[PDB]
Amino acid sequence: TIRNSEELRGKAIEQLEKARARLKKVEMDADQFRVNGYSEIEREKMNLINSTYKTLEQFEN
Amino acid sequence: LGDFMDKRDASIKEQLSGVKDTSSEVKQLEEQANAVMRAARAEISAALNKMKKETQ
Q1: Does A51 contact chain B (CB < 8 Å)?
Q2: Which of A12, A60, B33, B53 is 20–30 Å from A2 (CA)?
Q3: Alpha-carbon dihedral of residues A27, A29, A34, A40, nearest 10 degrees?
Q4: Could A37 and B21 be called an inter-chain contact, meaning their C-beta atoms sit closer than 8 Å?
Q5: What SS3 class is residue B45?
């Protein structure tokens, strides 16, 4: 009986802590992903405007 | 002797409970970590979408 509860508690805490550590890491991945996405969106917006200005100029031609 | 018997039994039962207690604590830790990781990912995705939509 003693060897069981301890193992459960050992294993259990290794697992809660591990799960929350993973949460942190993701909190990290997402955090990273959000920054990348934001930059990509800005560039894409830039894409649209730039290319449409090119299209304008061609229309003027 | 009766007290000695009780002490030894309690010490063992307490060890089992603590071992049971530790296992539950580790399960909670793992669950919390998993939930946190999900938030990061999902959160950032949502952000870009909302941000991506605004840029568009």
Answers
A1: no
A2: B33
A3: 180
A4: no
A5: helix
SS3 string, A1-54, reads CHHHHHHHHHHHHHHHHHHHHHHHHHHHHHHHHHHHHHHHHHHHHHHHHHHHHH
Question: What resolution in angstrom units was achieved for this structure?
Answer: 4.2
Picking from A3, A51, A26, the residue whose alpha carbon sits closest to that of residue B35 is A26
Chain interruptions in chain A, by residue before each (C–N > 2.5 Å): none
Q: Treating both helix axes as pointing N-terminal to C-terminal, what angle do A2-60 and B2-55 enclose, rounded to 10 degrees?
A: 0
Experiment type: cryo-EM
Return the structure tokens found at B40.
């990061």
CA-angle at B41, arms to B40 and B43, nearest 5°:
65
CA quadruple A26, A29, A35, A38: dihedral sign: negative
